[PDB]
């Protein structure tokens, strides 16, 4: 229903899309990219702008045999949702935000997705890195993982 | 017919019901169910032959176990006080509580929704405290039911 | 002689018929099959002898294990309603459902096909829900046969 | 109704009291506690169905299991001598030392506090010495109570 | 006397026999091999004594147990068919397949050949269909031979 | 039938090139390489070409020993395929097209192939990779196992 | 009741803010910052200042599952401490305290703090790494971990 | 009362003594100790109630178990030799070695020294020879005595 | 006497007898080595006391059992032939085999050498093929000597 | 008979070169070499001379304990085998080559070969790694290991 | 107590300076110093003085809970000592007289240490490292661990 | 005793020094080293010299605890053997007498050495790293392990 994407990444892409501007915390909706949307000198958002959210797939979606008929690839899949902003504190809400958003879907029959369960499954920090001279990004992440049953035509 | 079709686990909803009134008795996170009717089976053989002549069914029950984690005060207290009455302490009394149980189950695709129902479930023993040094608390129920009072697609 | 060859069990295609048709009864998605043709066995001994004097073997029947991973709700249906007819809730009848079995399977190297044919096969018990948090359901049968009508190849 | 609620184990409070007076005997550091009310169930069949006639419950009594850590010399000593008494050495009479049991536990949100109270709980065996090199002393009770004198929520 | 030495599984040939011809049975692929000749043994004591008085041996049989991962068509119909015939099917008949078994096996240093023959082993079942999902089918035979007929260094 | 190949590279090579152009969901059907044909500053399609799939074998095969006989290996081979254009939704339909692709033959009984099984296994995105800045390619990969009993020498 | 904050850094710092002057060793109280609040060259304290704590995130906070209804993560969140000064003596005294001070709250359920768990895991010594020669800060570490029931969106 | 504490296992000194002597018999090396005070429990059910309506203990024992690594050579001819005895071979006599048992532990604070003495331990098997290539000999007793005859704290 | 001290289980050397002869049977290659004297204990209760009345010993045995690698055809002709004699096939009589079993072996300092020697070793069962693909037979012998004949210091 | 060699590259590099003409696939029997053999700006063959097959233990053998007697090493042995042209068709029939070469000798018990065991265990491609520009060797490997009883002196 | 340290590396160090002369093996009694007391250049002894031991902790110290009371952490510490010297044997000496000066205090409950438990766990020799032309240290070290219960103050 | 050593490496020395002229293949008798004892540039024979075996403990000793008397550690030792000479034959035939000398001693009972055990458990060959075109030296090593009880003086 809400996205019957082709691929993970524009997947994830078209739920954080979907959401209503209520249910995110700061003032001003974010703006969601693919990773590859942007140049690095360009990564993160200006001043006077938004907050960027980016989406891409970090490590190898699993197709494991569902059983000896063939007709399914259990399919678990992984994504990494980056935060950056200026602000230290609008990072911290975007994780919020993006884990609210997300824990939605939880158990999805494919319903609204392609898939039997979308989920965060972890969060990382990073706001440790930023040095603290120059006006930099912040950033902060939610990993999340994707599983569900995929079609192999073995028996058309 | 329905075509076979996976489950994802989670998608079901588990409830059990006062048999007095159909109301409900709260209960919730589960982590394991498992419903098995069960008859007894009887085969006759005799001299006349090396094979199975007969074979016939008796003792009719449903084998339910349950793995759960959030405590429900509501029924551990119908347990005690047994059919149509709540207690706080254990019941002198003949009369073991008698649930029906409940489980609707939409299938992977969403090509059926499979309802199962099962009449006067009774458990011979309640976990109260199932404390282990730093993890919450998980229960475990065995219990019989008398019969499946209902096993169907309830889509559309 | 055939040859004796490898067998890769995805190949092995299983049935279930209906005896009073010989029609199928929808069921899929097989993880484990047994199949074990198995006899009681009476060995004679006397004072005569600390060697077995003869041997002989009774109690006839096939047993048959199998563990799955697709619902079938015809399957399920069968099975309570005993023989010649399905239902949606247990049935108070002493007959069980009798289930003809088939399995067709391609050796390694397409050398032979063996065909592995059961009749009669009852189930004590049927898993109806079998839900773990996490994870699709997975069913397990245990049941038995009368006798095995076809072991031969079928290549050809 | 009190909605269920997930249980972090620590948070649990257990004590033993002398049942002649209601004072506390001391007893600490405990690693597991599993306490589970239990009947002996009868289930009734005949001829004229399949499905379970009646079934009834008797033999009441409360199962006990803990693994602790810190041995208690009050406890062992107690358990020694008997109702009333104490002694530092095995004593040659039938009465088993009875103990009062009380577990006290706040949910995870502190939705409510469940009290559970089971009294003249009997323990068949006590561990002594229980050393392992390298390691620190860790005891089993297995034990049982009469009943449930209290199971509720004691919050406000 | 002959030299104790080690043995390496692999170097082993096992076969079977016809018992009415000695004419070789196809089969294949085995993975474990136990041969395990026993007796029951009754030792006698009496109040003249606390040590054992006497002990003596009776029920000879050979235990064999075999793992093997080749399907043998011609075994299977050979078991099934019962002492001097092949069958497709069950057979009705008081009379199981009686096999001659010789294990042949080189020292790992040549410095001996065992030769192990067993005769009339009788297996009590018989696995047909051994799947599992993602793996070539393996099979387990247990039964037992009435005597060693030959236990001898088969070299020069 | 379709490969009969002497090594696994080729023989996948050989799948995918056998694929009808109706199989593909872009409307220039892909040109097939082995990694080695081509050099990498002209690695991947230029402008106004069809996408370009490179294949090779990333990791080592397996000779497992499939029993005592000797007579077969159970071999276990892997082998990664690359897709490469400069349209970021090409390669993820390229990537879908792959999968359902190979995802015929999963349980050959070296029908089409000289194998038991060839599978996908996993998938992977590269697409995070390539500098936004720039024109240039976009990667993604599928993950194949392939799986068959091969033949030895020992016995000839 | 002391923190009530959105984010396990902000939480652990408003402990350790919260702490009486009676319940640190030294004679001045430190001051407790985030890691990225000083920049690097600046990082530690001056001559004639107080201790400074740095308080960050290090590595990935699990989201895991808690049951099948979906309504709550079992979140595990991990964070380090960093003490630093010119007195390797007062880093000695520091760990002793920060350990102290979040050994309260070891098995709060939610009352003074959002979590039902904080607890120091483990603790390092880097004074080896401080260069004998040169006046140079003294650094000494407490690794906490942190747990708690989270809540999500699924259920609204 | 005596606070409960926690025990370092290597801190008890265990030792045994002839109980015709007071003397010690050597032994050394013990790995694993326990000791187990246990009564028979007996139970009384009427049908006036489902509650237990007395319990009473009888058929004291204190069962002994001890995994120890170094070989005492007197304390198995001891054994062999029976009361007042011993034998360099086994003995047709009715009498087990009795031996008196010690054990005294410092808790882990030194807050109390826990004695434990146990009168006529006896032994119904002792291991004489356990190898075990590649590794040192290692030896387990199982046995009971007749009563504690004394557990207090020994300190001051 | 003697100071209990740890023992290498390689320096154990073990040998078989006929004790017909005192002549060698050839055996070698132990793996492991538990010879275990034991009685069966009888204890006395009665309405007296609840503490144990007597405890007597009787039915005398020594658990032998062995874990090997290197086949001895000696050893097993000699088990087959019985008392006094060998055979190439089981033989149909009354009498086993009775070995006489010696293991000497020097403590881990030499500070003594045990001497275990065991009279009329009996083995219910012989292993002669343990066949396991890709590893070097192993066998397991469980049998029981009459009475330990000596257990001593052999040193000096 | 065919090798008697003292080391493991020097057993493998005879069996190589034992081997027929006839059983070499391309025209040109290949030179067999130790790696260290050539200089490394000569390693692999020239244009019109045949290809090359380097011999080498590319990690540590293994020698365990076979037995408490120790007269034996179980000793595994481990070769990589290269074969480099600048056909990447002849070294993919070389792999083919050596594999079936090595696949004699598979359960050798010390006939040909000092071993009980010489088997490829896995094999590599590496033809990805031949800049296409460049006239250059095409690599591929067969992983090999050899297994036998390797004898101490211990006990002379 | 022999130190009451505050932490374990000036625990170690004061049971180092507390050992008698007699109890070194050289001539002259070591110095020992925290790792960071001297500057590297100048690390080790010069000629004419007596040897030097380095002590500091080199990985993370764990605190386990001990159980659900939360009163304490079974804490386990970790530390090398590092002997310098010119003199290859000197250091061998060190090495042997460290591990048998700390294993004292092996099972000390709290009588000399803070500790239950000081124990070398290993020790490395880094004498290869030293470079033949020149003088210049030999290096060799002692690992030790060290357990206790510490406290929480969670309960006042 | 034949070593009576300090250490491992001195240990390990001696027993190749101790070595019969008669026991090494080559016509001269190769010189013993510690790994330090020859600078780096002149490591390895000259020409017209016997061949150098280089020893040292190239990884740490492990203490483990025997039982809680704390008497003795159970010690092991790692050492490694290289073997340096141009002669490529040489070498392998001093990797063969290295285990043959240092496989004697495998169960020594602290007979000829201050262990229990002394034992080669790998061999390295290093010869492919020897480039072609110079005349530099040929290397191999022996791994050996080496086991004990090693005496604590903590009972004094």
């Known amino acids: ?156 | 017919a329905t075509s076979p079709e996976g489950i994802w686990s989670n998608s079901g909803a588990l409830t059990f019901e006062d048999p007095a009134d159909d109301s409900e008795i709260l209960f919730a996170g589960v982590r394991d169910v498992t419903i098995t009717p069960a008859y007894e089976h009887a085969e006759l053989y005799t001299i006349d032959s090396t094979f199975r002549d007969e074979v016939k069914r008796y003792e009719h029950n449903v084998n339910v176990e349950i793995t759960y984690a959030k405590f429900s005060l509501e029924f551990a207290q119908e347990w005690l006080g047994g059919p149509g009455a709540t207690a706080t302490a254990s019941q002198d009394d003949s009369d073991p509580m008698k649930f029906n149980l409940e489980n609707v189950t939409p299938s992977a695709s969403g090509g059926f929704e499979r309802t199962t129902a099962v009449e006067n479930v009774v458990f011979p023993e309640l976990p109260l405290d199932s404390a282990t040094y730093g993890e919450y608390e998980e229960y475990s129920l065995t219990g019989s039911g008398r019969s499946v009072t209902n096993l169907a697609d309830t889509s559309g």
Not at chain 1, 43 to 51: I, K, Q, S
Not at chain 1, 62 to 75: C, K, T
Not at chain 1, 115 to 143: C, K, L, W
């Open chain 1, 1 to 156: 229903a809400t996205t019957s994407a082709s691929h993970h990444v524009q997947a994830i892409i078209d739920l954080l899309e979907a959401a209503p501007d209520a249910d995110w915390t700061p003032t001003q909706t974010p703006t969601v990219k693919r990773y590859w949307d942007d140049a690095q000198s360009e990564r993160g958002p200006g001043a006077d702008m938004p907050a960027i959210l980016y989406v891409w797939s970090p490590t190898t979606s699993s197709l494991d045999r569902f059983s000896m008929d063939g007709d399914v690839f259990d399919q678990n899949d992984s994504i990494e949702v980056q935060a950056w902003s200026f602000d230290e504190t609008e990072v911290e809400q975007l994780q919020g935000d993006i884990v609210q958003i997300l824990s939605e879907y939880l158990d999805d029959n494919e319903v609204q997705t392609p898939y039997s369960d979308v989920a965060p499954t972890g969060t990382n920090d990073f706001r440790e890195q930023t040095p603290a001279r120059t006006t930099g990004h912040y950033i902060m992440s939610v990993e999340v993982e994707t599983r569900g049953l995929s079609e192999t035509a073995k028996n058309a």
